[PDB]
Amino acid sequence: VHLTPEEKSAVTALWGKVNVDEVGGEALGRLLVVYPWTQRFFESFGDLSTPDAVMGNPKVKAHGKKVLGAFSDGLAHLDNLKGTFATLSELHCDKLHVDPENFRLLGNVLVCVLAHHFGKEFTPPVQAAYQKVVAGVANALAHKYH
Amino acid sequence: VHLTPEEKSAVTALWGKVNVDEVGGEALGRLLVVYPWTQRFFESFGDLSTPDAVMGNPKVKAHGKKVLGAFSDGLAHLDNLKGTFATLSELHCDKLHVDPENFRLLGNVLVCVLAHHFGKEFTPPVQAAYQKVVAGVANALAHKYH
Amino acid sequence: VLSPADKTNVKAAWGKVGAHAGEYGAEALERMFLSFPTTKTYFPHFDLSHGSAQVKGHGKKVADALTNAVAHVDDMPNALSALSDLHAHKLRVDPVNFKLLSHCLLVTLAAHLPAEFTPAVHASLDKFLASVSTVLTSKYR
Amino acid sequence: VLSPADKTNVKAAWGKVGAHAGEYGAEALERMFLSFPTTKTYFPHFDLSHGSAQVKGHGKKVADALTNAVAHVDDMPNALSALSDLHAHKLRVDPVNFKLLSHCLLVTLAAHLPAEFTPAVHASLDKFLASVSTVLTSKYR
Ligand code: HEM
Ligand code: HEM
Ligand code: HEM
Ligand code: HEM
Ligand SMILES: *[C@@H](CC(=O)c1ccc(OCCCC(=O)O)c(Cl)c1)c1ncc[nH]1
Ligand SMILES: *[C@H](CC(=O)c1ccc(OCCCC(=O)O)c(Cl)c1)c1ncc[nH]1
């Protein structure tokens, strides 16, 4: 997909206020709590048996920052999401064996975190811009699956 | 998004022996039967009270013919489906108000119809080619929505 | 299967929403129309501009139906029976759209409930809305 | 929610799918892997080569489970209870994939039982597979 100029600005504008590490851990954690079957890929992270366990798990937090960090770097290329994420796409398919549907779920969870964190400033139009972005990244991450 | 040279070949090869007219009425008919809420757009077609009534309705067949006709022509423009249905997409959005999900449902009903109609000949590899085609067409028809 | 615990934190979150339910319902609608334009195909008779009274009106009905489902959360199929009948035999909204509005309702609650929207409550609310969606599409065919 | 007619159609159609369990189940799986490649992410521990023993055996396991559900269509929750727990607590396949396999099963049935795959039967089978999927994912969260 292709974001319009007035949406690319809303995304960047809002992202400049974000503490990536904080949001990443929060988003990955909620993913594992809201859609617990996603925990199938993190058996190595240890205990994820309860909401508090997941949100307090150091390995979940650490992985959250790497994921959202790669996501963040991707926002610098909103016009070339597929090419920017081509390598991680192959990794998730060939080595991680991660169903791309998972990227869609994380994307929606991320949107919920941004709203929870920003409240009123996460306006309908800003959400719209981000929905386009997460859909793009998910589509980009799924593009190299075979 | 991308079919291989052999995939497009298989598609056209199998389609070349398809009476676009007759299969069209069959696909649209089953759509209205399997997913009855899709009938919301055809209250003017007349009797659609029973599977037999729906299947034998001339208006349904007439529309099925019209619908599959554009589909077939699209098979001649696989390297660019968006442009092919661009104007058709705008119409379905602005005047017809057809939720694009309807395109996806018709696509899967059409695949089933092809399987029913061609049996053994509709092998797994052939199906895979058509799945790409129906997804491509659906996405193209949805691309201009706003 | 909404657990006795999902119901409790749902009742708690919705209790906090209180008299803002209507306003939040309309906001969730606008969010959906902007984030997923295809949902607009179901409201050709409505003016979908921001501030639209039709959207505001619909939003209150949608909120009310939700407030009612929460009041009868142990037996939602009844509380929503009339409505389920309405979407299934008349409105005929493709089932896929319910997750879109549900997601937007979640985003709305998240944007208004800093303290209440915990991971556990986020989880329960999601299951709740998926449950409502299931009930409303249960008679489609 | 399966009407007596759906149950009748399902039992009748699934009739011939009996002896060809492993074959049709295997074919349905192969159709899914080729048509929807992402589904292969759940079988990295399998040789997904055309005709592999693993795919043939799993095909039979799936078809037999459906034959069971059809046999006890009036008490599907209990009949599939063990399978439901397995997919919910261990396999943890994203719900979206059940629709994909369900579609490939319908395609398989359509290509093998032309006489039985009428529009009404088609609709009943689709509802049937969606029900089974619902039961199989009912304990996910
Ligand atoms: C915005 C989407 C996503 C991005 C950009 C992303 C990015 C990354 C990156 C960069 C790594 C490498 C970490 C490192 O080795 O330092 C990684 C690993 C991984 N990702 Fe993704 N990821 C995303 C979504 C997901 C989702 C939704 C899941 C699963 C539900 C997932 C599962 C994994 C797993 C299992 C690993 C391996 C972690 C380990 O054991 O070290 N990812 N991802
Ligand atoms: C493969 C996808 C489809 C294609 C390529 C397609 C193509 C067409 C075409 C060529 C027209 C005629 C436009 C014109 O020149 O005036 C049309 C009309 C229409 N389509 Fe689509 N269509 C598709 C699927 C559907 C589906 C599944 C629905 C709804 C369930 C839908 C509902 C309509 C309606 C209501 C009309 C107007 C009919 C009339 O005025 O007689 N279409 N479509
Ligand atoms: C969260 C689930 C939903 C709830 C609780 C809900 C609730 C309602 C209620 C209570 C009404 C009006 C009742 C009446 O006047 O008799 C209504 C109307 C309607 N709903 Fe739903 N709805 C939901 C989801 C959807 C979705 C996803 C769509 C489509 C994107 C949709 C489209 C409609 C339409 C078109 C109307 C007609 C509005 C009018 O003409 O005034 N609904 N809904
Ligand atoms: C019609 C729905 C389905 C049915 C009836 C079904 C049935 C089964 C059965 C009977 C087993 C064997 C359990 C045992 O050994 O006792 C199983 C295993 C499994 N299923 Fe499901 N399943 C369904 C859908 C899915 C889907 C959609 C996927 C993923 C795309 C999936 C992935 C798996 C996996 C990974 C296994 C493990 C196989 C192995 O390691 O041998 N299943 N399923
Ligand atoms: C009964 C089955 C039933 O009534 C039913 C079958 C199929 C659908 O299709 C909707 C597709 C869209 C979506 O799933 O999101 C519906 Cl809505 C209902 C039944 N349900 C559970 C057990 N038996
Ligand atoms: C049970 C609630 C429950 O345990 C549950 C909630 C939500 C989902 O989301 C997946 C839906 C995907 C789709 O729409 O196809 C699952 Cl899998 C389980 C409950 N309460 C009332 C009805 N059901």
Swiss-Prot record, chains A, B:
<dbReference type="GO" id="GO:0030185">
    <property type="term" value="P:nitric oxide transport"/>
</dbReference>
<dbReference type="InterPro" id="IPR002337">
    <property type="entry name" value="Hemoglobin_b"/>
</dbReference>
<feature type="binding site" description="distal binding residue">
    <location>
        <position position="63"/>
    </location>
    <ligand>
        <name>heme b</name>
    </ligand>
</feature>
<dbReference type="InterPro" id="IPR012292">
    <property type="entry name" value="Globin/Proto"/>
</dbReference>
<keyword id="KW-0670">Pyruvate</keyword>
<keyword id="KW-0702">S-nitrosylation</keyword>
<feature type="binding site" description="proximal binding residue">
    <location>
        <position position="92"/>
    </location>
    <ligand>
        <name>heme b</name>
    </ligand>
</feature>
<feature type="glycosylation site" description="N-linked (Glc) (glycation) valine; in Hb A1c">
    <location>
        <position position="1"/>
    </location>
</feature>
<feature type="domain" description="Globin">
    <location>
        <begin position="2"/>
        <end position="146"/>
    </location>
</feature>
<keyword id="KW-0360">Hereditary hemolytic anemia</keyword>
<dbReference type="Pfam" id="PF00042">
    <property type="entry name" value="Globin"/>
</dbReference>
<feature type="site" description="(Microbial infection) Cleavage; by N.americanus apr-2">
    <location>
        <begin position="128"/>
        <end position="129"/>
    </location>
</feature>
<feature type="site" description="(Microbial infection) Cleavage; by N.americanus apr-2">
    <location>
        <begin position="7"/>
        <end position="8"/>
    </location>
</feature>
<feature type="site" description="(Microbial infection) Cleavage; by N.americanus apr-2">
    <location>
        <begin position="144"/>
        <end position="145"/>
    </location>
</feature>
<dbReference type="GO" id="GO:0020037">
    <property type="term" value="F:heme binding"/>
</dbReference>
<feature type="binding site">
    <location>
        <position position="2"/>
    </location>
    <ligand>
        <name>(2R)-2,3-bisphosphoglycerate</name>
    </ligand>
</feature>
<feature type="glycosylation site" description="N-linked (Glc) (glycation) lysine">
    <location>
        <position position="17"/>
    </location>
</feature>
<dbReference type="GO" id="GO:0015671">
    <property type="term" value="P:oxygen transport"/>
</dbReference>
<dbReference type="GO" id="GO:0005829">
    <property type="term" value="C:cytosol"/>
</dbReference>
<keyword id="KW-0479">Metal-binding</keyword>
<dbReference type="GO" id="GO:0015670">
    <property type="term" value="P:carbon dioxide transport"/>
</dbReference>
<protein>
    <recommendedName>
        <fullName>Hemoglobin subunit beta</fullName>
    </recommendedName>
</protein>
From Swiss-Prot, chains C, D:
<comment type="subunit">
    <text>Heterotetramer of two alpha chains and two beta chains in adult hemoglobin A (HbA); two alpha chains and two delta chains in adult hemoglobin A2 (HbA2); two alpha chains and two epsilon chains in early embryonic hemoglobin Gower-2; two alpha chains and two gamma chains in fetal hemoglobin F (HbF).</text>
</comment>
<dbReference type="GO" id="GO:0006954">
    <property type="term" value="P:inflammatory response"/>
</dbReference>
<feature type="modified residue" description="Phosphothreonine">
    <location>
        <position position="134"/>
    </location>
</feature>
<feature type="domain" description="Globin">
    <location>
        <begin position="1"/>
        <end position="141"/>
    </location>
</feature>
<keyword id="KW-0479">Metal-binding</keyword>
<feature type="site" description="Not glycated">
    <location>
        <position position="99"/>
    </location>
</feature>
<keyword id="KW-0225">Disease variant</keyword>
<dbReference type="GO" id="GO:0071682">
    <property type="term" value="C:endocytic vesicle lumen"/>
</dbReference>
<dbReference type="InterPro" id="IPR009050">
    <property type="entry name" value="Globin-like_sf"/>
</dbReference>
<dbReference type="GO" id="GO:0005615">
    <property type="term" value="C:extracellular space"/>
</dbReference>
<dbReference type="GO" id="GO:0070062">
    <property type="term" value="C:extracellular exosome"/>
</dbReference>
<feature type="site" description="(Microbial infection) Cleavage; by N.americanus apr-2">
    <location>
        <begin position="24"/>
        <end position="25"/>
    </location>
</feature>
<dbReference type="InterPro" id="IPR000971">
    <property type="entry name" value="Globin"/>
</dbReference>
<keyword id="KW-0813">Transport</keyword>
<dbReference type="GO" id="GO:0031838">
    <property type="term" value="C:haptoglobin-hemoglobin complex"/>
</dbReference>
<feature type="modified residue" description="Phosphoserine">
    <location>
        <position position="35"/>
    </location>
</feature>
<dbReference type="GO" id="GO:0042744">
    <property type="term" value="P:hydrogen peroxide catabolic process"/>
</dbReference>
<feature type="site" description="(Microbial infection) Cleavage; by N.americanus apr-2">
    <location>
        <begin position="59"/>
        <end position="60"/>
    </location>
</feature>
<dbReference type="GO" id="GO:0019825">
    <property type="term" value="F:oxygen binding"/>
</dbReference>
<keyword id="KW-0007">Acetylation</keyword>
<dbReference type="GO" id="GO:0005344">
    <property type="term" value="F:oxygen carrier activity"/>
</dbReference>
<feature type="site" description="(Microbial infection) Cleavage; by N.americanus apr-2">
    <location>
        <begin position="8"/>
        <end position="9"/>
    </location>
</feature>
